[PDB]
Design an enzyme around this catalytic site. Structure first.
Site, mmCIF file in Angstrom:
data_model
loop_
_atom_site.group_PDB
_atom_site.id
_atom_site.type_symbol
_atom_site.label_atom_id
_atom_site.label_comp_id
_atom_site.label_asym_id
_atom_site.label_seq_id
_atom_site.Cartn_x
_atom_site.Cartn_y
_atom_site.Cartn_z
ATOM 1 N N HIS B 69 -83.222 24.204 -24.399
ATOM 2 C CA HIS B 69 -82.188 24.097 -25.117
ATOM 3 C C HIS B 69 -83.166 24.629 -26.648
ATOM 4 O O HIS B 69 -82.080 24.657 -27.793
ATOM 5 C CB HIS B 69 -82.044 22.595 -25.141
ATOM 6 C CG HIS B 69 -82.355 21.025 -25.937
ATOM 7 N ND1 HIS B 69 -83.026 20.769 -25.274
ATOM 8 C CD2 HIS B 69 -82.469 21.336 -26.959
ATOM 9 C CE1 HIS B 69 -83.467 19.540 -26.243
ATOM 10 N NE2 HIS B 69 -83.330 20.283 -27.147
ATOM 11 N N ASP B 125 -84.846 21.952 -18.219
ATOM 12 C CA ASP B 125 -84.494 22.506 -19.542
ATOM 13 C C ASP B 125 -86.081 22.612 -20.050
ATOM 14 O O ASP B 125 -87.207 22.130 -20.482
ATOM 15 C CB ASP B 125 -84.714 20.993 -20.766
ATOM 16 C CG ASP B 125 -83.998 21.320 -21.657
ATOM 17 O OD1 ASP B 125 -83.854 22.353 -22.385
ATOM 18 O OD2 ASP B 125 -83.728 20.566 -22.218
ATOM 19 N N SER B 223 -87.588 17.321 -29.842
ATOM 20 C CA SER B 223 -87.283 18.382 -28.235
ATOM 21 C C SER B 223 -87.807 19.083 -28.094
ATOM 22 O O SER B 223 -88.649 19.716 -29.187
ATOM 23 C CB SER B 223 -85.896 19.172 -29.053
ATOM 24 O OG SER B 223 -84.690 18.192 -29.214
HETATM 25 C C1 LIG Z 1 -83.832 15.230 -29.497
HETATM 26 C C2 LIG Z 1 -83.417 14.834 -28.357
HETATM 27 N N1 LIG Z 1 -82.105 16.368 -27.357
HETATM 28 C C3 LIG Z 1 -81.363 16.597 -28.236
HETATM 29 O O1 LIG Z 1 -80.125 15.943 -29.030
HETATM 30 C C4 LIG Z 1 -80.816 17.991 -26.463
HETATM 31 C C5 LIG Z 1 -79.190 17.687 -26.486
HETATM 32 C C6 LIG Z 1 -78.254 18.677 -26.398
HETATM 33 CL CL1 LIG Z 1 -79.091 20.056 -26.803
HETATM 34 C C7 LIG Z 1 -76.868 18.018 -26.241
HETATM 35 C C8 LIG Z 1 -76.276 17.271 -25.603
HETATM 36 C C9 LIG Z 1 -77.320 16.166 -25.922
HETATM 37 N N2 LIG Z 1 -77.388 14.783 -25.709
HETATM 38 C C10 LIG Z 1 -75.926 14.443 -24.626
HETATM 39 C C11 LIG Z 1 -75.534 14.326 -23.938
HETATM 40 F F1 LIG Z 1 -74.192 13.899 -23.389
HETATM 41 F F2 LIG Z 1 -76.310 12.913 -22.819
HETATM 42 C C12 LIG Z 1 -75.792 15.736 -23.078
HETATM 43 C C13 LIG Z 1 -77.190 16.043 -22.276
HETATM 44 C C14 LIG Z 1 -77.306 17.431 -21.375
HETATM 45 C C15 LIG Z 1 -76.081 17.988 -20.959
HETATM 46 C C16 LIG Z 1 -74.760 17.734 -22.385
HETATM 47 N N3 LIG Z 1 -74.860 16.596 -23.111
HETATM 48 O O2 LIG Z 1 -73.738 16.491 -23.630
HETATM 49 N N4 LIG Z 1 -78.538 16.381 -26.464
HETATM 50 O O3 LIG Z 1 -79.554 15.227 -26.150
HETATM 51 C C17 LIG Z 1 -83.356 13.594 -28.097
HETATM 52 C C18 LIG Z 1 -82.731 12.405 -28.693
HETATM 53 C C19 LIG Z 1 -82.644 11.382 -28.145
HETATM 54 C C20 LIG Z 1 -84.196 10.888 -27.060
HETATM 55 C C21 LIG Z 1 -84.484 12.455 -26.084
HETATM 56 CL CL2 LIG Z 1 -85.648 12.573 -24.906
HETATM 57 C C22 LIG Z 1 -84.054 13.896 -26.748
#
Ligand SMILES: C[C@@H](NC(=O)Cc1c(Cl)ccc(NCC(F)(F)c2cccc[n+]2[O-])[n+]1[O-])c1cccc(Cl)c1
Lengths: 11, 276
Positions: B69, B125, B223
């Site tokens: 991602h 991922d 990430s």
């Molecule tokens: C950096 C951050 N990672 C991201 O932002 C990656 C990322 C993306 Cl690309 C899309 C959606 C989300 N979170 C929201 C969610 F609904 F869950 C989710 C998870 C999977 C697919 C779609 N959605 O919607 N996150 O977390 C992170 C933050 C805190 C802990 C960890 Cl390990 C990683």
């Protein structure tokens, strides 16, 4: 707010 | 020689929190990393505009591991190609050019897992990046090991702590230097019950429970970074996970989810021995 890096890498 | 840090294992010196990990084998709310603490830490740097793109890890002199991602994610219009990014290895400070210490490398080719699921839950991922030319190892640049079946089975257990590092946000502002936090792996049922997102066997979650008091988590910018564990058997560091996803950062009742490196090692091996 990142310090400029050498042009050698950018090119 | 993977997973043996020049400034620690190689000199028989321990960092200040690795004991916490070993005692368990029976970035928000983190701390500044020590010099040479995570020599496999890689920063994915975007050329234009110059900014923090993601974290990553050095697994060989020519290969870098990260989260898919970080390079490809249609929902947020993200689709980076080789020439859009640079790899900065051996760094400590986030924004400064660490002359005579860090090494910047260009990317030759990017390889995203063919079954990476960006549409639903970021299943699988993972991505590999082959560097144009080998990076010279040093006190601040050294590869981490990849887990074998045995290592994964004995270390990937609920309660067992791993270490996550990155230059990401300090809160759900930005750190001066690399941040580090040790977090316990959580039981699958708890991970599942903490979210509406469908969890798969290619991920595991980590972080403290509300009643455990302590906290910590990755956050935007982390990430692609590594979730590592130090094997109590051979004293080498192994990358068991890749910072993948979460809902918010360091929220009570929520946990960070990591790509299960061993589960996708078959793909990693395939790519490495076929292209590199
Ligand atoms: C950096 C951050 N990672 C991201 O932002 C990656 C990322 C993306 Cl690309 C899309 C959606 C989300 N979170 C929201 C969610 F609904 F869950 C989710 C998870 C999977 C697919 C779609 N959605 O919607 N996150 O977390 C992170 C933050 C805190 C802990 C960890 Cl390990 C990683």
């Amino acid at each position: 707010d990142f310090e400029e890096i050498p042009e050698e890498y950018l090119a | 020689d993977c997973g043996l840090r020049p400034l620690f294992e190689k000199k028989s010196l321990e960092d200040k929190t690795e004991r916490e990990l070993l005692e368990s084998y029976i970035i928000v709310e983190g701390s500044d990393a020590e010099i040479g603490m995570s020599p496999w830490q890689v920063m994915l740097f975007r050329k234009s505009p110059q900014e923090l793109l993601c974290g990553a890890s050095l697994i060989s002199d020519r290969w870098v591991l990260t989260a898919a991602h970080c390079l490809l994610y249609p929902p947020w219009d993200k689709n980076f190609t080789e020439n859009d990014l640079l790899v900065r290895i051996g760094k400590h400070s986030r924004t400064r050019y660490e002359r005579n210490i860090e090494k910047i490398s260009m990317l030759e080719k990017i390889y995203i897992h063919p079954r990476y699921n960006w549409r639903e839950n970021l299943d699988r991922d993972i991505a590999l990046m082959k560097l144009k030319k080998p990076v010279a190892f040093s006190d601040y640049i050294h590869p981490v090991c990849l887990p074998d079946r045995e290592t994964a089975a004995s270390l990937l257990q609920a309660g067992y702590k791993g270490r996550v590092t990155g230059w990401g946000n300090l809160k759900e502002g930005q750190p001066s230097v690399l941040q580090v936090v040790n977090l316990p792996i959580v039981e699958r049922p708890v991970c599942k019950d903490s979210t509406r997102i469908r969890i798969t066997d290619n991920m595991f979650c980590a972080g403290y429970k509300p009643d455990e008091g302590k906290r910590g988590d990755a956050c935007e910018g982390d990430s692609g970074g590594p979730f590592v564990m130090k094997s109590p058997f051979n004293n080498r560091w192994y990358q068991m996970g890749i910072v993948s996803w979460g809902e918010g950062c360091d929220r009570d009742g929520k946990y960070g989810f990591y790509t299960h490196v061993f589960r996708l090692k078959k793909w990693i091996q395939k790519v490495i021995d076929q292209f590199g």
